[PDB]
Symmetry: C4
């Protein structure tokens, strides 16, 4: 039986710690993969942590980062949520330097994108084998979520980008059923930029909160229906959630336009909560450091700056990275609704830190019906390592 | 089908060795987690060893114990009983520096407590995901068993503490059904102190034998019914079972009062045997060393000092630690009754020993119908290690 | 239920990357077996990577290659496709310095050949145990595919050789049902030489494209029917696919005769595509380096040199090795046809490279309905290693 | 459903190599347990290799053999046949310095014996938990097979010894059903000595071929019926199969008496083959080196020295050790009969070799319907190791 995921997303008051894998700590001595872009996604039986290795291990000569962010050795693998991304526990998924995965109730789907910059190949797997391919249509680093995709009535949905890092690119959503792409849509968004979407199911549609890497310190929101009609705009809330971003007191929300006058960004998430929203961001507006989650009243519908909750997960003295959304299935929680959860990546090493390598660890939070007190579940690795 | 666990506890004449994981020995070269508080608990299919890592490994720089007894890196994981708590065999359970786990016949429940001292969060998991949360209610190191909890008719029971280490604190029991707390009770015990309970099912109720960390060299007994009425007092037997404790010939039992004029303690267990009892304690009254089990006649009901059996499991030249209770399910043993078993932790390293780290190994004994001869299944690691 | 595999092979326009295990890279620090001859084969549930260890690990003193290409320590093991051939993930199959494996829909069959050169023993396993034996019939290095065998209606088929490396030998096919050899045929091929066949099912027969190690720069084709009648000849296409081979513009195809005036070779594959063919070969005509796949029009039936597609998988600056064929089952793909896939081995170390050891890694491609752009998924290990 | 194992043992013409785990080779760099006494036994699904660790690893300081042959750290564990006895693949069975295991069709039974020399405890496990205990009855190193026990109609049978190494001891057989000892028999054998039996099912009875450690260079045979009546005597064949033993031309068989004038021995096996026998022995009469198997005509019933087959498995330049018997179940082979198989242990290290440690590897042979050529599948580890 295929997962419905047509339930409303639960309205959540705080987030409880789910897991912490301590990858880098363990990887000081154990045999753990160098990774980046480690997202969480769930089947009806288990939550798995997916990650992109660089085909090398921590504390090995091959972790040296003379290589490309995309390389031939990179692969998408997985472990049960909470395990480190270690060699001996790892499930191979796809060849990939960008990916998305998600379970339809019967099987894992997975899409790893690899090949050259000018002509990337994304390969859909299903049941553990290649079932379909989507080639670069715009010739410039075909790419996708680096977080969970989203399946609704046994059909699966994901967002990809192809084009410039730093100016107008091109954006499609895809629709798959059992590893066969049965539909796509070209997403009109001129002046806006979309990458790395964080998507989750809500009341029968896919909702995404993505990264604008061109002009905007606010994140695009893309809401896609089963049949592929969509709405695109920006996160309405009167707070900024990208980094780098400006001050809060320097910032006016927009439902329709990137605001703030900066490039770059980072991947992140957020959850529609009726008309409200929970929105993650780094505590530093200049760096990938600290992580907070902010609940804003009416922030999904209006340029509100009514904050009603804030909850810190990583302190501003400690590294963070990417963050992304996912939901717990009803077959696991037995609820009326879909439980929202996020992961945070905690990037360690060069250039920030004086090592030859760069990796990432993670912690996973989930929505609960009781507020939850601040703390920091940071990465905690003592750098530099022996190989350095 | 949910486990009944309404059977009487079997009356046992001695204990047979079940397992020995040799964690520290193996961890001299293999990749094994630094741990403490490793308890045993069983499902209808298997017995698992749960433990709290410190997010580091043996013989790695991160085992250095500049960290807190509670830290952000600590997690609850598990392995099949008898496996070392090694990276590659480990099942992630919860983020935790204190925990309890137990199986209801369908799934594992688990509760890991983490967060700051002033405002801890305990998160109930069920089927491998967060299902509920109980925040610190008294603001001072929310905490629980570090041994198996107890499920009876698909409902699960555990004891937590919140408050001072060394004076009056506050004590609640909780009742869960499929990871949802459906009931709690505030345990009146003025002048007495309760932590780290060792609990097991017996004739339809939970029985616990706990740690008093304030005034008492005798252990509290808490017996809790399905509907959460309870009895609380002290282990009646005319022997002391905490450490530090006084002499035996200096000691008068009490059913109602801590006796002996000392603080601190250690976690331990014991089994009601009709009106008799089996009671573990360290052989040293001053240190966490050696381990014995003593059967006392009428010791559960009267301040008896009629010892009828004694069985040594670790010699007084060798380190011990915590001990705790659990039962074998009827689906595994095919008996009329619930088989009592205990584990013992064998704590190695600083401050006792000259190393940077501190860990724990374990051995597991179970009740059998034949007396069993003394011996020592001590930890056996040659210290100090290379990292030292 | 036994697999049919009576479907036609799908007509494929390009090949998508399936996996990359990065064995040697990972094996720089992780505990990975030294191997050679790593082929892929699939069951109705999963694709597995099989390989022949040399009973030693990477970066260990025992990888020193004073040993024989065939030795007593060599064994056939397996891992899920994409895992490195690491100790802790490895499934033991057979004792072997040559092997073939394949799934009949119920169980894995496997045949490992071991023993002395003059009197080898090949042992058929089935369900994970020895079920039958075929001894050397010609006294000179009994041997077989080093790739997947082929089961059709619950019956399994494989090709072996016994005789000289470099002159006329002797060639049998075998037919097994549930690990019991129920039929064999002596393959008349005077002047031709056959080793290491790459075989796959197509329209109810086994098709193979093999290695001639005596006179021929073209590969033999052997097509075997259920009842063991066969056709044998050479790959008709007007391109050469062995190495070492001559120039393309120096080369005339033959359906019936080895052409090109050289010894040695390498194992490789190819796919009948109606009357066309896909044919792998190394890009270097002198060395085991680079890997391409070429589609030739009418190349299965005529000495065509009409190339219609070419796709590079490993660049001519990088090592390759063996290649072999396999198909995805219908129980996995849900197609009308059998999906063709190949693996490539990427041999590293001595004598080519200045190390004491020699190993192999792999990448796996599969047939898809969209052309696919060139790139190189080479092995990427920085040599020499520490043990060197 | 419980296994019958009431079929006659198959009449076998040679033995084919089944597995080779290369434990010591792999253990030079990988994390593998120091072990001794590694036997094979099978369930309806799989063959497992059981072994007794010394709670330490290869190439670790703890492999130093200042310890006892029996120690507190020793444990019985298992791996799938062919895997090395490595930490990360190992299944914990029992605490043990002597053991026996065997599957009844539903579950594994296992008996590990531990505790002091003067008062050993043997603990029966079943389904992965302690179910029963047999204490030392004669006060002198209670002990058992170190090979597979034997279950017939869901009932299980094993032989133990208690008493002197080197003079008259005492010998019982036990009968278990689902981990509960339901019967035992005291085995009258005055002047004879019995240890370490190698037992297998045949035509509804247990047959064993054991070790006499007192006076006899011939092995005792014990045949035990379901209801525990038994026959005991010696291997009739006119060849000797213990080591140390005398010359063959110096030796007269006996059905009833130890012959040859020596102490010590080694564990080994043999198979009734109608009236004939296959009998293993070391090739050296003075040392644990080389291994052969000999088929003797009428050798089970008469003091025959008609040898009809011989097959070498390990050469006389290479170390051997213990050997033992087991059968493949009908649920795996689909035969009319029970397939005989043996394992051989290949003991490496001190005192023989200049190291601090001592371990064992293994190879497994099985009976097949075709003669099989000589060779040597010896252990192949280059000694001494780094820790030495
Ligand atoms: C890390 O790698 C550094 C740069 O290496 C050089 O450039 C790369 C692209 C390769 O071509 C490499 O083979 C070249 O040597 C080295 O300078 C440095 O030694 C490395 N450090 C360590 C610790 O391995
Ligand atoms: C163990 O750690 C000792 C104390 O470290 C110092 O204090 C802690 C809290 C950290 O701030 C650490 O970074 C500081 O240096 C060290 O003195 C000692 O070097 C360590 N020993 C080993 C073997 O790693
Ligand atoms: C690799 O092995 C080389 C050759 O070893 C010699 O010949 C082989 C067949 C054995 O008999 C071996 O024991 C002999 O010493 C050695 O010369 C060399 O030391 C080895 N290198 C390493 C790094 O182990
Ligand atoms: C191996 O062990 C040798 C003997 O050790 C001594 O006696 C044993 C029973 C223990 O008491 C031990 O602690 C004593 O030192 C040592 O002489 C030797 O150093 C050891 N060798 C290695 C390589 O560890
Ligand atoms: C395909 C690709 O390389 N994606 C990048 C991503 C990218 O640079 C920007 O979004 C520009 O398009 O940035 C980052 C990043 O840390 O910012 C990591 C991702 N790395 C990987 N997914 N491997
Ligand atoms: C929550 C907490 O830190 N619990 C402690 C416990 C505690 O110090 C006393 O019981 C005072 O309340 O003591 C000990 C101890 O060894 O005595 C270990 C436990 N460590 C862990 N559970 N991590
Ligand atoms: C049985 C055997 O040793 N087969 C060889 C094979 C062989 O040398 C030629 O085909 C001549 O018959 O060559 C090669 C090779 O790389 O060319 C590897 C194979 N190695 C292994 N299969 N182990
Ligand atoms: C219980 C015990 O220690 N059994 C011994 C066994 C024993 O010395 C003789 O049979 C005398 O009774 O000998 C040997 C041996 O190699 O000869 C190994 C066994 N070691 C272990 N099973 N651990
Ligand atoms: Ca931006
Ligand atoms: Ca106390
Ligand atoms: Ca050739
Ligand atoms: Ca003898």
């Amino acid at each position: 039986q295929f997962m419905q995921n047509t339930e409303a997303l639960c309205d959540v008051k705080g987030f409880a710690p789910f897991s912490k894998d301590n990858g880098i700590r363990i990887g000081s001595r154990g045999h753990v993969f160098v990774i980046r872009e480690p997202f969480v996604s769930c089947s009806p039986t288990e939550c798995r942590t997916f990650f992109l290795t660089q085909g090398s291990l921590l504390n090995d000569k091959h972790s040296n980062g003379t290589e490309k962010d995309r390389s031939p050795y990179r692969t998408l693998m997985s472990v049960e949520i909470g395990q480190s991304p270690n060699v001996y526990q790892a499930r191979f998924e796809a060849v990939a330097w960008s990916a998305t995965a998600c379970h339809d109730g019967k099987k894992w789907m997975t899409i790893g994108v690899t090949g050259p910059d000018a002509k990337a190949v994304a390969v859909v797997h299903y049941g553990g084998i290649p079932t379909d391919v989507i080639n670069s249509w715009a010739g410039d680093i075909l790419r996708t979520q680096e977080s969970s995709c989203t399946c609704i009535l046994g059909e699966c949905y994901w967002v990809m980008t192809d084009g410039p890092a730093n100016r107008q690119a091109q954006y499609r959503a895809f629709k798959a059923k059992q590893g066969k792409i049965i539909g796509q849509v070209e997403i009109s968004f001129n002046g806006g930029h979309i990458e790395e979407c964080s998507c989750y199911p809500n009341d029968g549609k896919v909702e995404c909160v993505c990264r604008d890497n061109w002009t905007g310190t606010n994140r695009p929101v893309l809401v896609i229906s089963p049949d592929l009609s969509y709405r695109v705009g920006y996160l309405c809330a009167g707070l900024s959630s990208d980094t780098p971003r400006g001050e809060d007191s320097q910032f006016t929300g927009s439902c329709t336009s990137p605001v703030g006058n900066q490039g770059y960004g980072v991947k992140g998430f957020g959850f529609r909560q009726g008309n409200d929203v929970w929105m993650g961001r780094t505590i530093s507006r200049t760096s990938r450091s600290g992580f907070e989650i902010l609940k804003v009243r009416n922030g999904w519908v209006q340029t509100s700056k009514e904050q009603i909750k804030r909850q810190v997960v990583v302190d501003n003295l400690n590294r963070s990275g990417y963050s992304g959304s996912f939901t717990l299935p009803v077959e696991l929680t037995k609820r009326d609704c879909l439980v929202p959860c996020f992961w945070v990546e905690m990037i360690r090493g060069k250039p920030a830190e004086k090592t030859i390598w760069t990796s990432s660890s993670s912690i996973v939070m989930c929505g609960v019906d009781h507020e939850v007190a601040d703390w920091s579940w940071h990465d905690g690795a003592i750098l530099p390592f022996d190989i350095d």
